[PDB]
Amino acid sequence: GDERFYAEHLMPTLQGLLDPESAHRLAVRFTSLGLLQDSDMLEVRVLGHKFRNPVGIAAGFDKHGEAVDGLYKMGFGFVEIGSVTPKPQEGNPRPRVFRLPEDQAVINRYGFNSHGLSVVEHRLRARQQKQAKLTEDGLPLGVNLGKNKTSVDAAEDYAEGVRVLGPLADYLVVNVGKAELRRLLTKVLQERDGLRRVHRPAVLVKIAPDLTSQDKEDIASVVKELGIDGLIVTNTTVSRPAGLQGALRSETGGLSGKPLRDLSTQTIREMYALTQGRVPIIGVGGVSSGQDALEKIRAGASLVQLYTALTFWGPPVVGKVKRELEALLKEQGFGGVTDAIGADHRRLEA
Ligand SMILES: Cc1cc2nc3c(=O)[nH]c(=O)nc-3n(C[C@H](O)[C@H](O)[C@H](O)COP(=O)(O)O)c2cc1C
Ligand SMILES: Cc1ccc(-c2ccc(-c3nc4ccc(F)cc4c(C(=O)O)c3C)cc2)c(Cl)n1
Ligand SMILES: O=C(O)c1cc(=O)[nH]c(=O)[nH]1
């Protein structure tokens, strides 16, 4: 009911008042304080868990696990925190976040600023009973694991994240030659298998859209060989699509938001084909409407995430994507999200 107020007045006012990193910090703190029903059609069972709805908040908004409960209150069907590095680290120098308002886009080069595993673990331990309730009610928690800039043993950094935060997570994410990738992911999976849980977390690989065809075939091959549980497609892009209008489009960093929509959907289609539909995909990049979510589901995604759209449309975007997706599924005769997954590949086969 508040869509137009946030879209035309509140969010533009906040963006005019604050630089984007300051607004980001305010948004996390405000969400952490809290303040204010999903159709059965939107339920997805995947990654060994129930998802009450398929619209998650992507990594990088709540990097340090400070606002999880508020994000569920906002309506997200799942929350991914991180990236979290083993030791605290500052990230890149400021300024490091740039708004492209004409393009409904952001460029960032945060550089994995992180409070570190211990601080984040302590925050999640404080709410671990609450999360157990939320997970069993269909609201899972994901943790994106990073590595420290100065680490010479990347696999050791990811393994430490599994040891510290694996007991608290429903899924874990590692952002990504082929033999090196195999060795690293083998270590992560062995550490995951070593946890003493009834519900050990799924392990996912998150990829950028900036990969060669050989890179994508190599990743698909290793993911299937090792039994990785899913893919997150995609991270931000270092590319700059034609026609960007924002004055800051030349800043170095990853571009997110509406300009990433096509590249991410194309990459979802390709990875779904290269894994023969065997590997669940979380589709990410430029989702700001139910139509965007449906396009990624038809391309092969089982779940979607959004981030940049929250910065332009505000909290109302979560209910908007969910109710629009539901309506589009009903309009087009799908029984639920699950029936639409990969529908675009069935069209092409026909
Ligand atoms: C400011 C900002 C910070 C981000 N930080 C992370 C991060 O720490 N780890 C990660 O895996 N992705 C990070 N991302 C990428 C998002 O998770 C997502 O993949 C990307 O922004 C595409 O989604 P969107 O177009 O809906 O924003 C970040 C994105 C933005 C815009
Ligand atoms: C009730 C209510 C109202 C508004 C917000 C709310 C306020 C600000 C933002 C916000 N997050 C960002 C995160 C990363 C980033 F790179 C930029 C931003 C920006 C931006 O400056 O472009 C904004 C505005 C999001 C939600 C919340 Cl969380 N709750
Ligand atoms: O912290 C960051 O710079 C960052 C990490 C990441 O995975 N993606 C992104 O866009 N930024």
Side-chain angles (χ1 to χ4, degrees), residues 1-28 30-36 38-44 46-49 51 53-72 74-128 131-132 134-146 148-151 153-179 181-182 184-186 188-195 197-257 259-329 331-348 350:
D2 291 327
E3 290 87 346
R4 201 170 178 183
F5 168 71
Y6 279 81
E8 291 174 3
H9 299 277
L10 183 53
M11 299 313 286
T13 293
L14 291 177
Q15 293 179 329
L17 204 50
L18 296 176
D19 69 276
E21 178 166 355
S22 296
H24 184 187
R25 294 167 65 82
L26 186 70
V28 171
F30 200 80
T31 301
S32 81
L33 309 180
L35 62 93
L36 203 35
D38 292 324
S39 157
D40 296 341
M41 290 188 62
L42 296 182
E43 183 180 295
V44 178
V46 72
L47 300 168
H49 295 83
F51 292 78
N53 73 74
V55 183
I57 174 79
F61 179 75
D62 191 5
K63 283 171 167 289
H64 324 296
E66 302 174 281
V68 177
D69 289 304
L71 287 162
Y72 291 118
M74 213 176 287
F76 289 106
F78 60 112
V79 169
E80 191 174 312
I81 67 159
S83 298
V84 188
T85 59
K87 302 171 169 131
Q89 63 174 41
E90 281 189 45
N92 286 329
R94 301 186 174 116
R96 55 201 179 165
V97 191
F98 308 93
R99 206 183 290 111
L100 289 58
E102 294 84 356
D103 306 306
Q104 295 176 21
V106 167
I107 291 168
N108 85 91
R109 54 178 183 256
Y110 261 123
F112 295 94
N113 58 308
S114 174
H115 295 179
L117 285 171
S118 286
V119 170
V120 176
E121 195 227 347
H122 295 165
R123 292 192 180 124
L124 295 187
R125 288 288 181 185
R127 59 177 299 280
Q128 183 178 2
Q131 186 60 52
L134 289 159
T135 297
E136 206 280 339
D137 225 339
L139 297 173
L141 171 68
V143 175
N144 191 297
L145 299 176
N148 282 116
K149 186 165 185 68
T150 60
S151 154
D153 189 356
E156 188 48 45
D157 276 11
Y158 296 129
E160 180 179 351
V162 174
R163 292 191 295 266
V164 175
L165 295 184
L168 299 147
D170 299 313
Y171 70 85
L172 300 170
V173 189
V174 175
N175 293 0
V176 305
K178 185 174 181 184
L181 178 66
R182 187 186 289 111
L184 181 144
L185 293 180
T186 292
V188 171
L189 288 166
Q190 286 171 344
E191 208 62 72
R192 189 279 307 273
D193 293 343
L195 294 171
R197 303 187 61 179
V198 170
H199 312 88
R200 282 169 297 187
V203 173
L204 288 81
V205 163
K206 179 168 185 188
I207 67 176
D210 316 312
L211 303 160
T212 66
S213 290
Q214 189 64 52
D215 290 340
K216 284 174 256 186
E217 291 169 329
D218 289 356
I219 289 163
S221 168
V222 173
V223 158
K224 293 182 289 168
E225 180 196 356
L226 298 188
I228 287 293
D229 296 299
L231 288 151
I232 304 193
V233 184
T234 65
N235 216 315
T236 54
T237 182
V238 301
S239 79
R240 298 290 182 267
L244 289 177
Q245 295 167 345
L248 301 174
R249 63 189 178 271
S250 71
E251 287 288 349
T252 57
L255 172 71
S256 63
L260 178 57
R261 193 159 55 176
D262 295 336
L263 182 52
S264 60
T265 296
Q266 301 168 339
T267 311
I268 291 165
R269 289 200 308 270
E270 289 169 20
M271 297 307 295
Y272 187 85
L274 289 172
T275 57
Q276 294 75 45
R278 293 171 58 199
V279 179
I281 293 162
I282 304 184
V284 195
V287 175
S288 65
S289 63
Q291 180 70 37
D292 299 331
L294 181 59
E295 289 179 12
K296 285 181 158 54
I297 290 159
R298 293 185 87 111
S302 297
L303 302 168
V304 302
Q305 296 170 321
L306 63 80
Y307 180 170
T308 298
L310 181 68
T311 76
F312 290 101
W313 306 86
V317 80
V318 186
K320 173 175 167 287
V321 174
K322 292 192 302 180
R323 81 175 65 89
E324 291 174 1
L325 176 61
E326 173 185 0
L328 293 165
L329 290 166
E331 180 196 33
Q332 297 171 45
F334 291 109
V337 169
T338 303
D339 292 312
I341 302 170
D344 197 54
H345 298 256
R346 298 194 281 282
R347 172 186 67 89
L348 291 165

